[PDB]
Amino acid sequence: QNSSDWVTTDIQVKVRDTYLDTQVVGQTGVIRSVTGGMCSVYLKDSEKVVSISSEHLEPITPTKNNKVKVILGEDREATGVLLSIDGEDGIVRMDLDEQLKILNLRFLGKLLEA
C-alpha cells in the first residue's frame, strides 16, 4: 500500500479498535494538526487532545447536507457541502464555487461543525 498521504485536517476520525487505548476505541475526534510522523486528533468524548497515527485513525463518511473535505486528489484541502451521493461514487458540491463535482466517498471526509 504505502498510501499514508490520506491525512486531512478539519475532518473527523474514528479510533480503530486496533488502537492501544481501548478507552478511545470507537470514539470520534477532530484532527487539529497533521504530521507525516503522527496526527493530532481531539477526542470529543474524551474532551482531551491526543495524537494518533493515521494507521490508528479512521475516516468518517459525511452525511447529506453535511460539509466534506477532499482528503485526496488535486482538490485536496478543498471543502464543500454534500448534496447527494451515488451508490457507485459520491457527488459533492463545492461550497466555494457552488459547482457540482463527483468524487468517490474514499476521498470525501466528514467535517465537524461544532
Side-chain angles (χ1 to χ4, degrees):
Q1 306 303 310
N2 298 320
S3 279
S4 77
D5 55 11
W6 75 280
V7 188
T8 310
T9 76
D10 322 335
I11 62 182
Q12 309 173 17
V13 305
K14 189 183 196 225
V15 173
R16 299 177 64 154
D17 64 3
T18 308
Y19 191 46
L20 298 187
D21 190 354
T22 300
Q23 285 183 347
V24 176
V25 168
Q27 308 304 308
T28 308
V30 183
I31 302 182
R32 181 181 75 216
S33 299
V34 64
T35 306
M38 298 291 301
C39 211
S40 187
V41 188
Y42 180 89
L43 222 308
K44 173 195 193 293
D45 180 8
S46 325
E47 193 68 24
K48 186 178 189 221
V49 307
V50 305
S51 301
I52 302 171
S53 308
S54 312
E55 293 299 346
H56 294 295
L57 302 149
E58 250 189 15
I60 306 293
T61 27
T63 78
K64 304 178 182 265
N65 303 142
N66 198 337
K67 298 183 185 309
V68 311
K69 191 174 178 143
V70 180
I71 62 166
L72 285 176
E74 171 192 8
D75 296 339
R76 270 187 317 246
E77 195 185 353
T79 73
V81 184
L82 182 69
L83 181 71
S84 69
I85 331 182
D86 296 356
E88 185 186 2
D89 314 314
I91 304 176
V92 305
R93 184 185 302 160
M94 271 295 136
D95 183 12
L96 305 182
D97 294 346
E98 295 301 342
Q99 184 180 354
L100 183 96
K101 295 184 185 220
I102 306 175
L103 300 83
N104 185 258
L105 300 185
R106 187 176 72 119
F107 305 147
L108 308 180
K110 180 188 191 192
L111 313 181
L112 203 304
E113 296 182 350

